[PDB]
Structure 1
């Protein structure tokens, strides 16, 4: 489990829903359609 945007295989990566976005964080990587509410 190296992950998508980086070599990482660290900054433990969300498996949740199989989107693997943590490499460059799901904060930096966005437009996924997530929003900040609550």
Structure 2
């Protein structure tokens, strides 16, 4: 189902990575891993 997410970075349903209370676009997520602490695992 695709109309209730409204990306909190971006208002978006599309482009937003749905993961763990986050609501950022895929790009936005790619931008953010450092301040958060995610480093490549694979």
Give TM-score scaled by structure 2 length.
0.49
Structure 1 vs Structure 2 CA RMSD: 2.2
**Displaced runs of 4+ in structure 1, greater than 4 A?**
none
5+ residue gaps, structure 2, are: none
Structure exhibiting the larger radius of gyration computed from Cα positions: 2
TM-score, normalized by length of structure 1? 0.50
Number of matched residues?
37
Return the alpha-carbon distance in structure 1 between the equivalents of residues 31 and 21 of structure 2. 18
Unaligned runs of 5+ in 1: none
